């Protein structure tokens, strides 16, 4: 199924009938970082498998729902169970849910992820406001927009200079200052490692030379689809570890250690993003 | 359809019957840079859609013709409507038209493109003679030659050391000196960004570190197919902007600004390439 | 055919019945470096085409056998005719033979390849013990593990920090010292160029900046599948040429020159690896 205007419209039609919610904010949460979705008020849970033209996700399994409702007086739509390109989903399968968000009315997309730290200033448990990216799949002919252009959503050749909204970064930092956790909050450049292997120690060292501050396996495909169709983005990484220090000390990593860091910061991130949603212009 | 010997031959058979032209020069022109094709003498226009085994191009639409005739006393064949890998064409679809050129008799291929400037010496409106390249798709398992080798055209493992002919670069510079526009003409290394998004500001900064002078979304796939089968290449970029200056000043870009630069230099480029064709050994 | 548990088991069943050999060492040899396979004792030769669920290799042609038997008192299984991703094989086709090795009992995989030298200390005819890698296809969304995870073999997110066993590197160097050819043996970082074109002179210069010591078109896909499923690896490159010196002097390369270097070192490499096999703990 192509992520075109007709097919995105059929999915939006079904959602509108079932939920009665008209959202203007969308959220996509990282692994272990989705507790906010369980606190949406007057919520409606829609399994992907029920929605016309949504991508098939039964080979990977696990949760896959769209959740609509209210947070802080604001109408939102959330993806519960994010789609990652290392699972083998096509460009069209990744893009269709973001384009349905656009047709539903979404004007701002908030995204979190887990990432490895490259910059020597970053420690486990820190947050990084993403201000730009290095897209190795895009340079290498695996950009999420390779294929015919869907003209109703955006232009053939997008400019990504302003993909990460500066005012949303400033609001996020302001709220961290108000609650006295600004000492945890950095800004930086995100490198997209297609995955699913963690980057190797020699790859981490290369990324340090090339000006990257953090590395992860998500987020950039969704940012590009959002920017193409005029949706503003805030993206925040939670740092699991410092890859460069771990290479110097020959320390390993595994998904369990990553999820332990997510549990340690889950409740603070939930409170932060509730306030960002409440305060969005 | 595979870009093999049998299928390229069937296309060449059809073309030979309809045109009666035996070309020894091929040309592929960048966007907004194709006016020379409309001045080919005693010309024959063949829609791709009419030619056996040519790739299907109706999803993208717009012009798609092969044009044969004479320039400066020389027999040429032109692609009007270039095929780009960011549109989703396969390796086989890109390679088949170049291999038909080879079977028709082409010994020299001339190519222009629009590109972003990285080297601090480059300004909007400058020309760069391409002397080498950095092929991010090729390093990343999206090289145009991935697949079985077509032995009748070339070897399994090509050497690209001499893909950009030195004597053709010297002729191009000589003719610019004769007409007193050598102040516009540089040489440099071309980075292939698969596209279709312009490279991000942090990607431009990375490319400066890695020794790239210009960046674009075309040309390298065709150069590799030509080099594989023994066709000599001259490739020239027209610089739309300096990506590094625009990042320092937070200036945006869009396809309209690119095409305005092409219109500004179209007539000079047409005159330059007519003389290069006339003067080729 | 997916490289899953059921399909790998059917292939292992067939092999077990025909060979009666239970191997605990696997070997994959580079081009022109396979003479050891012809000296396996009490050997059994099984054409890939006869084995259930093995990948189809008739478009490329040439030899394709699994060979089982004894070396130095140890039970081994060899791939005669390696599968390379530049030929167009899928992730699933590359992974299935390594996963059959795992089900047969393989605990250690030994690999050789031919490679270009980047580090200024490397000369034609030198050996490099691989201690880490830079995987441009993996960064760029062409990692061999993209797709659903096969949980019976390994985890969704592997750590490659220890993919190249340190004790096996130390054994290999010890045996070179015993036979007084340690002056030929270096260690270094391997860059994976997807291929099939040799990397360009400007790509070689980029790789020098990024900390790479050698460059080649194989090995990293097999290493990742082995590490995922708990098989220890030793990988050794034979250096064909120094790419940086050849760029400074405008010297070309071709597959014939590569194979001449392999013939020059074939007999020494055969003797080295026989002793490594004999001495493995
Ligand atoms: N890519 C990525 C990534 C990620 F997506 C989430 C968390 C950490 C990541 N890299 C860590 C690299 C590393 C490898 C081995 C030991 C220590 N560190
Ligand atoms: N890739 C490519 C490219 C091209 F193919 C043609 C013309 C310009 C290109 N990059 C410009 C990068 C850039 C982004 C945002 C603002 C200014 N500059
Ligand atoms: N990639 C790779 C590679 C290889 F797989 C085996 C042997 C040599 C390799 N590069 C040599 C680069 C080069 C290009 C032109 C002239 C001299 N040198």
Alpha-carbon gap, residue B190 to B215, rounded angstroms: 6
Three-state secondary-structure class, residue B57:
coil
The alpha-carbon gap from B5 to the nearest alpha carbon of chain A, in Å, equals 27
List ligand 3's pocket residues with C-beta within 6 A: B 159, 161; C 114-116, 193, 198-199, 204, 215-217, 240-241, 243, 246, 252-253, 258
Q: Which domain holds residue B94?
A: 1-281
**Are the beta carbons of A188 and A64 closer than 8 angstroms?**
no
**Are the beta carbons of A216 and A115 closer than 8 angstroms?**
yes
Alpha-carbon gap, residue A183 to A259, rounded angstroms: 22
Out of B132, B155, B159, closest to residue C202 by CB: B132
Three-state secondary-structure class, residue C273:
helix
A190 lines ligand 1 (CB under 6 A): no
B124 lines ligand 2 (CB under 6 A): no
**Are the beta carbons of A168 and A234 closer than 8 angstroms?**
yes
Contacts of B137 by beta carbon, 8 Å cutoff, 6+ apart:
A139, A140, A141, B85, B143, B144, B192, B194, B220
Radius of gyration from C-alpha coordinates of chain A: 18
Alpha-carbon gap, residue B75 to B69, rounded angstroms: 6
**Are the beta carbons of C80 and C66 closer than 8 angstroms?**
yes
**Are the beta carbons of C127 and C237 closer than 8 angstroms?**
yes
Q: Which residue has a Cα nearest atom 5 of ligand 1?
A: A216
**Are the beta carbons of C220 and C190 closer than 8 angstroms?**
yes
Torsion over CA: B237, B243, B246, B248 (sign): negative
Three-state secondary-structure class, residue B118:
coil
Three-state secondary-structure class, residue B138:
helix
Give the number of the ligand closest to the Cα of residue B260. 2
Alpha-carbon gap, residue C133 to C195, rounded angstroms: 16
Task: Find the length of chain B.
Answer: 281
**Are the beta carbons of A236 and A165 closer than 8 angstroms?**
no
Three-state secondary-structure class, residue A27:
strand
**Are the beta carbons of B87 and B217 closer than 8 angstroms?**
no
Measured N-to-C along each axis, helices A220-228 and A91-104 cross at an angle, to the nearest 10 degrees, of 50
Q: φ and ψ at B118, to 5 degrees?
A: -105, -55
User: Which of the 8 DSSP states describes residue A119?
Assistant: S
Quick one: how many helices (H) and strands (E) in chain C?
Answer: 8, 9
* CATH number, domain with residue C38: 3.40.50.1580
Radius of gyration from C-alpha coordinates of chain C: 18
Angle at A126 between CA A123 and CA A132, to 5 degrees: 105
Q: How many CB atoms lie within 10 A of CB C42?
A: 10
Secondary element (H or E) of residue B220: helix B220-228
Distances (CA, A) of A44 to A24, A65, A109, C190, C218: 16, 10, 19, 51, 50
Which pairing describes strands B74-80 and B65-71: parallel, antiparallel, or unpaired? antiparallel
Contact yes or no for B197 and A145 at CB 8 A: yes
Distances (CA, A) of C46 to A13, B68, C16, C68, C170: 57, 54, 11, 8, 33
Contact yes or no for C224 and A199 at CB 8 A: no
Alpha-carbon gap, residue B246 to B243, rounded angstroms: 5
Q: Which of A80, A201, A79, A85 is nearest to A135 (CA)?
A: A85
**Are the beta carbons of B79 and B30 closer than 8 angstroms?**
no
Alpha-carbon gap, residue A13 to B215, rounded angstroms: 42
Q: φ and ψ at C195, to 5 degrees?
A: 85, -175
Alpha-carbon gap, residue A236 to B50, rounded angstroms: 52
Quick one: how many helices (H) and strands (E) in chain A?
Answer: 8, 9
Contact yes or no for B224 and C197 at CB 8 A: yes
Q: Sort residue B80 into left (φ over 0), alpha (ψ -120 to 50) or beta.
A: beta
Domain count, chain B: 1
Alpha-carbon gap, residue B28 to B108, rounded angstroms: 11
Top residue of A141, A166, A189, A230 to mutate, by most chain B CBs within 10 Å, is A141
- Residue C57 tokens read as 């290799």
A218 lines ligand 1 (CB under 6 A): no
Q: Which of C136, A210, C191 is nearest to B208 (CA)?
A: A210
Instruction: Write down the experimental method used for this entry.
Output: X-ray
C132 touches chain B (CB under 8 A): no
Radius of gyration from C-alpha coordinates of chain B: 18
Distance of CA A275 to the CA centre of its chain: 18
**DSSP letter string over A48-110?**
GGGSTTPPP-TTT-S--EEEEEEETTEEEEEEES---GGGT--HHHHHHHHHHHHHHT--EEE
Which pairing describes strands C108-117 and C214-216: parallel, antiparallel, or unpaired? antiparallel
- Residue B17 tokens read as 């019957």
* Chain C, window 225-264: residues with a beta carbon less than 8 angstroms from a chain B beta carbon: 246-247, 250, 252-255
> Which mutation among C82, C118, C192, C198 tests ligand 3's pocket best, with the greatest number of atoms within 8 A of CB?
C198
Alpha-carbon gap, residue B92 to B147, rounded angstroms: 9
């Amino acid at each position: 199924v192509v992520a075109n205007y007709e097919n995105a419209s059929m999915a939006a039609d079904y959602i509108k009938r079932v939920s009665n919610v008209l959202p203007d904010i969308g959220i996509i949460c990282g692994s272990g970082l989705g507790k906010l979705i369980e606190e949406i008020e007057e919520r409606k849970v829609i399994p992907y498998i029920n929605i016309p033209n949504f991508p098939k996700t039964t080979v990977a399994g696990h949760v896959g729902n769209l959740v609509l409702g209210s947070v802080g007086g604001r109408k939102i739509v959330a993806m519960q169970g994010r789609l990652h390109m290392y699972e083998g989903y096509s460009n069209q399968e990744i893009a269709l849910p973001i384009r349905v968000m656009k047709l539903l009315g979404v004007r701002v997309l908030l995204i979190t992820n887990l990432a490895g730290g490259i910059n020597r200033k970053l420690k486990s448990g820190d947050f990084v406001l993403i201000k730009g990216h290095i897209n190795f799949p895009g340079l290498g002919l695996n950009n999420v927009l390779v294929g015919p252009n869907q003209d109703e959503f955006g232009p053939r050749f997008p400019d990504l200079s302003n993909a990460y909204d500066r005012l949303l970064q400033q609001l996020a930092l302001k709220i961290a200052q108000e609650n006295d956790f600004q000492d945890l909050v950095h800004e930086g450049v995100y490198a997209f490692n297609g995955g699913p292997t963690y980057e190797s120690p020699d790859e981490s060292n290369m990324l340090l030379k090339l000006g990257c501050d953090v590395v992860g396996m998500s987020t950039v495909p969704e940012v590009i689809i959002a920017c193409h169709c005029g949706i503003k983005v805030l993206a925040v990484s939670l740092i699991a570890n410092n890859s460069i220090l771990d290479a110097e000390n020959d320390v390993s990593i595994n998904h369990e250690k990553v999820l332990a860091v997510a549990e340690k910061r889950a409740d603070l991130l939930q409170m932060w993003f509730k306030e960002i949603i409440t305060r969005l212009p």
